[PDB]
Amino acid sequence: ASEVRIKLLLECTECKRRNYATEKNKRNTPNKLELRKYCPWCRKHTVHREVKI
Amino acid sequence: MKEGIHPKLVPARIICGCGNVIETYSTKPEIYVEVCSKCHPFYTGQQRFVDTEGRVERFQRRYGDSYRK
Amino acid sequence: RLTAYERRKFRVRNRIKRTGRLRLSVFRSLKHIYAQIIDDEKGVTLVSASSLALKLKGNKTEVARQVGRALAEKALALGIKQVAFDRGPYKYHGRVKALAEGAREGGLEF
Amino acid sequence: PLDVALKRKYYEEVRPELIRRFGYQNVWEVPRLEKVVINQGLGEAKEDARILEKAAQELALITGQKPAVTRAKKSISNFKLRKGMPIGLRVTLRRDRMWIFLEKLLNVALPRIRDFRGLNPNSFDGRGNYNLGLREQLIFPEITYDMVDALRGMDIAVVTTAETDEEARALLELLGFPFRK
Amino acid sequence: MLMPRRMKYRKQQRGRLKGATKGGDYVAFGDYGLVALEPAWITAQQIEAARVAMVRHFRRGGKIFIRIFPDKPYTKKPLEVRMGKGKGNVEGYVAVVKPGRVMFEVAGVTEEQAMEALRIAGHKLPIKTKIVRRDAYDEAQ
Amino acid sequence: ARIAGVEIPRNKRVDVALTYIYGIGKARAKEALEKTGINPATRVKDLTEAEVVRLREYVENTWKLEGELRAEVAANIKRLMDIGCYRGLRHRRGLPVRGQRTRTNARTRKGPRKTVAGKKKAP
Amino acid sequence: MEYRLKAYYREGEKPSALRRAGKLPGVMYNRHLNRKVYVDLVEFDKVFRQASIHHVIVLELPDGQSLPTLVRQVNLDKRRRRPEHVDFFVLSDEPVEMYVPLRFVEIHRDILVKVSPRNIPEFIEVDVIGDSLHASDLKLPPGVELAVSPEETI
RNA sequence: UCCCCCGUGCCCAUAGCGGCGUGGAACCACCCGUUCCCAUUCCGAACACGGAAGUGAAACGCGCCAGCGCCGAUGGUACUGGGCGGGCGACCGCCUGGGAGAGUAGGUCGGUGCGGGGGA
RNA sequence: CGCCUCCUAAAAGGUAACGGAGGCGCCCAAAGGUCCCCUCAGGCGGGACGGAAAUCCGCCGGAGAGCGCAAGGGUAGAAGG
RNA sequence: CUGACUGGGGCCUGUAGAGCACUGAUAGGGCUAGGGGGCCCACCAGCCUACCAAACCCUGUCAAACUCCGAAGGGUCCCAG
């Protein structure tokens, strides 16, 4: 990690729990990350959005 | 061939100044040209045009043998 | 010096062999199509089928589907059920694909 | 396939003569055209006017075939070149479209060349293929002064089944390639 | 005097002097040679001293072959320092020479001239040496 | 490339337009149009392709032009150098050939001034 | 040529023992045979110093055979500069590659040649800063083959 | 069982490179086409489909040849486990058991398993 | 002064000195998953601008290229494109 | 009864030695792109080079961080004393 390469949380769009930690380069990828991910609460795959860590 | 990206080749007739006519295929239906194989100096015999000169010089000069003997 | 043909043949076959299933290999000539189910551990062929042996002629694809059915018929009879399809240098398409369809149609599992 | 004047000439006039000149024993032993490859070296479009679809479209007009792009294999400081930059157009002509292009080339294009006095006898591959370079693209019949932004030249590869220079020369000569010596 | 034009590594560990020479044990070029009887690190300045001795005896005549090359860096700490603090600086170059090695050969000169020259050369070396003549044994290798 | 190897400018008169060809001065322009019977005052845009080829055919066959003329001019200069007369020597060093002074001027042949230090004066 | 030299057979006699008693251990072989032999050192030394690998040496075996050989290999002792081992190559009718001396009428004392044993020469003449010749141009007395590359510099 | 071809393995150059020669009935390839499925950062080149007039030219298969490559003894030596001596040292020697590499002789222009098609 | 690579290290592992040499404190949303396809550097020859080196063609070329960064190992029957 | 040690057998290894196929070092000679220098010449190219210049070949060598090779031994498992 660094200033350009930040740490981030992935929040399930449906039930709103954060389920995943990961990183991105906010210069290369300034958009909030959106990834389909299995949500343990919803028990199904859901679009997850980047959230501030 | 791939659809959409290529230009159609159609029957076409290319016409030269020397009255030559060429039956071929092109993107354009009819095309008019200043020169062709049939009339180009290098192609036709040796049609040496204006220059028969070779080159002449120097002692084609002559004119004459007048300076005395 | 290897050809793209051989590399492709080596590549898909190597991947196939690792699973350890019996190998349904398929050869496709300009005229004909051949299939033999192979035990790579014993290096032995258990069952075979081909357009040439069955003396079929016609639509190459339709012929392919038939030799596929033929292979399966002899196959289940020998107790053979599961298999891994080896397309080798060929795309999974057309004649090769029709043969695979015939083998499946016949009751082969893959 | 279709009838093209140069193609027919190859089969009825050129093929018998070649057997006469060289005495092949097999109908495949005798020289053939394999393909013609055209290349616009370009790279004038490396940075400035970073896309010249103009050269592609005009090349598409001449051949009837849309060229594919070629990108830099490596970065080169001196050429102001970054690896992967679009710096060329190449189109591969085979079969009818090869004949048609060669036909107009020999009949009208080469004669249009400035101060043209025949091709270079020495430009043979050594392996029975030939290459020639053009500096203007207006030399072709279906390209005119009105439609052009700037002069672009090209490289032309004519590839034959002939093993040797001697066989390939006779073929190209018999087909109508005009050589200076 | 002789030394490697460039090197992959600046310093080498000292290592050993066991055994007879690996090779170079037969006359290769000239007629007469000088062969080592004892193992040593022969220095660049030693090699050059022997060569120039030979050169002077010939009055620039004849041909001299040098069949050893000093490619081993010789390291030494500066004077009056203590042990440790890294390896010393490279101060010269040596050639590892084991018994049987033909160090020098001469040719195009009389037998009397070669013998004496090779004798004077031997006196510049820190080892016992022998003078040899080319043999069928040499030419057979 | 309309004629000869060059594209003479449309929207100007033929007699003028022909001059843009290397090897045709105004004099050969007037004579070519007369000999082929085309109006000297007609804009290039407004010529029948019949007029075009007639004018074209004449001009190329009557005189040597463009590249060929340049080549023939080149051979002449080359000849002078190789023999090599004083005239040929002048072409070697790129000085005037026709007896002009070189203490001054001659800039057209010599090119831009390569200024150089002069002679200093006392104090 | 030619030279003759007494030879004897050995089996399990130690090489060190043989050499300590003045004998040179050796082997003689060809396509058909291979035998463990030894020769007297001082005698061998007399012959080899003239025969070398250029001229034929005939081994008078104890069993009465008189076999035609070429010396193919002589292993030296690097420390003492003395021969440790000899390889006698038994000649037969088939062509052999060998080294044949050169007489200048020099980077090469001799030259490598594939010649029939019946036809083995003893001389090859070469007619004579920094000009030189390349083996290709050589004399080549009948039944003889250049066994190098004609590029090779003499 | 034996010969040929087609698949597919195994040994991993004694199988390779080159130079010759040979084969189309069958098989295979090239080939004939590009309607159809599918395809080309362009190209029916490739991938693919429909074919069967032609040629074994290319490819492939099969033979020959040792120029190269590859393999490679026997003998001898280096080194050495273990046991002993010598030298001020650098280092050297003996006993017993093991034993290279290089090079020499030489060898190789493959061997073999299973299935299919054809032939005797 | 912690970590990585090679050597030292005495052919298992491990093995020291203020011994001989380098590198890390990052990075990538594609530089990750999978499917399909493709094969390098270099050398000679050929080709407008065009060069030692841009892109194009042919022949040779088993890996000497490439795999973000040190080094080593691995690797085209791909981990490379 | 498994132990140290020992017999047999399998597998793992890259040292001693050697070698030069890789990475580098390297002596003499040949053949050779860029020339140094050269009498010429520049109008435009040529020829020698008792010298410094890749690759290639021949002869001959060197290496802890080179290996096409490669021991004795060593390690480990099994059976046995």
Ligand SMILES: [Mg+2]
């Ligand atoms: Mg996480």
Ligand SMILES: [Mg+2]
């Ligand atoms: Mg990321």
Ligand SMILES: [Mg+2]
């Ligand atoms: Mg998930």
Ligand SMILES: [Mg+2]
């Ligand atoms: Mg929970």
Ligand SMILES: [Mg+2]
């Ligand atoms: Mg965030």
Ligand SMILES: [Mg+2]
């Ligand atoms: Mg079409």
Ligand SMILES: [Mg+2]
């Ligand atoms: Mg049917």
Ligand SMILES: [Mg+2]
């Ligand atoms: Mg079928």
Ligand SMILES: [Mg+2]
């Ligand atoms: Mg298959």
Ligand SMILES: [Mg+2]
């Ligand atoms: Mg015929």
Ligand SMILES: [Mg+2]
């Ligand atoms: Mg040529």
Ligand SMILES: [Mg+2]
């Ligand atoms: Mg060709």
Ligand SMILES: [Mg+2]
């Ligand atoms: Mg035009």
Ligand SMILES: [Mg+2]
């Ligand atoms: Mg030490």
Ligand SMILES: [Mg+2]
């Ligand atoms: Mg000292």
Ligand SMILES: [Mg+2]
């Ligand atoms: Mg020291």
